[PDB]
Design a protein around this ligand. Structure first.
Ligand SMILES: Nc1nc(C[C@H]2C[C@H](O)[C@@H](COP(=O)(O)OP(=O)(O)OP(=O)(O)O)O2)c(NC=O)c(=O)[nH]1
Ligand SMILES: [Ca+2]
Ligand SMILES: [Ca+2]
Ligand SMILES: [Ca+2]
Ligand code: NA
Ligand code: NA
Length: 324
DNA sequence: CCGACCGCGCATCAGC
DNA sequence: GCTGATGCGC
DNA sequence: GTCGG
């Protein structure tokens, strides 16, 4: 919490730009600034000092000097006191309510969870589920629970067909102590770029059959987004409901997918910048060679995460060591 | 100065 | 009925 | 809002 007041302020400004101004690039600018400042190992003494960090520019340096001298930001103070902005900001915490729906709801006097619960007819299916689990979806997931969730998913997937490959990615695969949701990448040897039906559906159905998956936000042939819950013992309290995504990826793009969806964002960026310096380009699907004039060639064969590191002559980085 | 800032799968809607 | 645009999440 | 061409 060296500069926790500054990072809190920048995050509040970010959330305002995202939810109220509908300016996703300023949201990400403020987020970027807050991240580098949370990494900085000194209590910032001036805006000029922070401005030396990448992502901190002139207007953020100005806000830091105001916050340092006064302990507050009058832009934020006015925003907090604006009832419309505060209601729009709150409503976007419902999964499925974005800035457009939030503003539309607030315009017609729908401002609170109660107002939403009163107006289920004006909600689409996703929004109804987000409202249903409003508190649960904002809880984090302890790693011990993730581990238990991974066991169910891998086991039920194996039960459908032994040849499925399922990998839990995101912050969990990087070894985090808690996760926000569960990210599952699924493949099968029979599904390639140049190619069985219902491959995702059968896994989703089996997980519903054992009452692990409890709700569906969206589902198609390659991506499922829904809700799941660990089973409870007959004497203890039930578990929170959890967000879970399952994506079906072709096997020849699978390990590029695992690489991408493990992250982190900073690590992917560093790994792709290094790939370029070696004459390769990595995206979420493929690694391709670069010709002399920057033309990408055909995708290279990838049987594992390690193959990707080998191509660019990088020693394998363990998922836990991929924070950057 | 000024354009880019990831962009795609799914759900939903406006227009044909 | 269809297609393309958009909101949303990530 | 920040960055870079
Ligand atoms: N789960 C998920 N992630 C991404 C983004 C990629 C790049 C990112 O470094 C990596 C993990 O991002 P994610 O939002 O899952 O964050 P994570 O590190 O898992 O933290 P948390 O979810 O809070 O536990 O996946 C997606 N694609 C685009 O954003 C996606 O559809 N689903
Ligand atoms: Ca995640
Ligand atoms: Ca609950
Ligand atoms: Ca993408
Ligand atoms: Na939302
Ligand atoms: Na997330």
């Amino acid at each position: 919490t060296l500069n926790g007041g500054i990072t809190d302020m920048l995050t509040e400004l970010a959330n305002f730009e995202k939810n109220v101004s509908q300016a996703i690039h300023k949201y990400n600018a403020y987020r970027k600034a807050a991240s580098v400042i949370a990494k900085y190992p000194h209590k910032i003494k001036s805006g000029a000092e922070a401005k030396k960090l990448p992502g901190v520019g002139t207007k953020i340096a100005e806000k830091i000097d105001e916050f340092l001298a006064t302990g507050k930001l009058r832009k934020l103070e006015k925003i907090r006191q604006d009832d419309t902005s505060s209601s729009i900001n709150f409503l976007t915490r419902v999964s499925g309510i974005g800035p457009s729906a939030a503003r539309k709801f607030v315009d017609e006097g729908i401002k609170t969870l109660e107002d939403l619960r009163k107006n289920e007819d004006k909600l689409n299916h996703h929004q109804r589920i987000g409202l249903k689990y409003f508190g649960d979806f904002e809880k984090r997931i302890p790693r011990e629970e993730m581990l238990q969730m991974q066991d169910i998913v891998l086991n039920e997937v194996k039960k459908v067909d032994s040849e499925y490959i399922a990998t839990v990615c995101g912050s969990f695969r990087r070894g985090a102590e808690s996760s926000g949701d569960m990210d599952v990448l699924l493949t099968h040897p029979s599904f390639t770029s140049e190619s069985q039906p219902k491959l995702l559906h059968q896994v989703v159905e089996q997980l519903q059959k054992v009452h692990f998956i409890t709700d569906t936000l969206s589902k198609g042939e390659t991506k499922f987004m829904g809700v799941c819950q660990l089973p409870s013992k007959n004497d203890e309290k039930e578990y929170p409901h959890r967000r879970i995504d399952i994506r079906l990826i072709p096997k020849d793009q699978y390990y590029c997918g695992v690489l991408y969806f493990t992250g982190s964002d900073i690590f992917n960026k560093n790994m792709r910048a290094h790939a370029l310096e070696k004459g390769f380009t990595i995206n979420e699907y493929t690694i391709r060679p670069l010709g002399v004039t920057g033309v990408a060639g055909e995708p290279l064969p990838v049987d594992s995460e390690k193959d990707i590191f080998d191509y660019i002559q990088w020693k394998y980085r363990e998922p836990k060591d991929r924070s950057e």
